[PDB]
Design a protein around this ligand. Structure first.
Ligand SMILES: [Zn+2]
Ligand SMILES: [Zn+2]
Lengths: 192, 88
């Protein structure tokens, strides 16, 4: 079928069953590793806890001593009561009006694929920026991140990224506007 | 905040209306912000019902594709912020 290839990639990744409480993380890591090889990105797997691999894809900048841009996202999704769905939550069915139904279609596999396709387009079209970009794909966010991002930020592999600024998920907005979570200085929850 | 400045400039270039909201004390950013890294939470979904964690969670393909376009403009801006005191 005729379909934009970014949408096809999104639907592929929606079909990987990274659903709690036992996500298919092995298949997600393999998908990111193969994507890194196709895109010509460096790939580092950091197993922060047994069974919990953080995958980092890296596009080095022209000034690699500047701090980097982190494009972060989580690979797990919350459970389903599948009897209440119009389409199988792991089929990634796209209806004739263009709607893609899946657990993860909003939270947050869309963003992971958007980062990957934006990088692919900019890189293959010949753009180069001073700052390195790292895409980090972490497990375990939907249960509090205690075997995922909370551990990753103490790792030497994390410190080596020399992060200068991160993006991660927002939330859908039903209006024409977009929501953005803003924080500055020390975050309010450590103030304390 | 040079990062917010660059993000906000791209959104003005693209005519995107932003609604800044407080950052939840949850998610990956809880940990990244707590170790001192500046961050924003953003998913380019507008005209989309709020369905995270719900039945029939769905996203229209044109909103998804416009989202890839938005990141193709955000990435050059963020990755081209010139050297800062924090880079030394
Ligand atoms: Zn999420
Ligand atoms: Zn969630």
């Amino acid at each position: 079928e005729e379909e934009h290839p970014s949408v096809t990639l999104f639907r592929q990744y929606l079909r990987i069953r990274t659903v709690q409480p036992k996500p298919d993380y092995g298949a997600a890591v393999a998908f990111f590793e193969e994507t890194a090889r196709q895109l010509g990105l460096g790939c580092q797997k950091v197993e922060v806890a047994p069974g919990y691999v953080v995958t980092v894809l890296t596009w080095p900048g022209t000034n690699p001593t500047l701090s980097s841009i982190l494009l972060n996202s989580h690979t797990d999704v919350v459970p389903v009561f599948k009897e209440h769905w119009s389409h199988d939550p792991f089929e990634a069915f796209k209806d004739s009006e263009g709607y893609i139904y899946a657990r993860g279609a909003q939270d947050m596999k869309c963003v992971s694929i958007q980062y990957l396709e934006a990088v692919r387009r900019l890189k293959v079209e010949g753009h180069r920026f001073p700052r390195t970009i790292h895409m980090t794909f972490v497990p375990d966010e939907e249960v509090g991140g205690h075997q995922g991002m909370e551990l990753f930020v103490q790792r030497p592999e994390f410190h080596a990224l020399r992060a200068g600024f991160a993006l991660d998920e927002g939330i859908a907005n039903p209006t024409d506007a977009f929501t953005v979570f803003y924080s500055e200085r020390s975050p309010w929850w450590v103030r304390v | 905040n040079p990062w917010w400045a660059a993000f906000s400039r791209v959104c003005k270039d693209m005519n995107l209306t932003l609604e800044p909201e407080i950052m939840p004390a949850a998610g990956d950013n809880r940990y990244i912000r707590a170790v001192g890294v500046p961050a924003l939470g953003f998913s380019p979904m507008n005209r989309t019902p709020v369905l995270l964690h719900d039945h029939d969670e769905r996203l229209h393909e044109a909103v998804f594709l416009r989202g890839v376009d938005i990141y193709t403009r955000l990435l050059p801006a963020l990755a081209s912020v010139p050297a800062l005191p924090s880079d030394s």
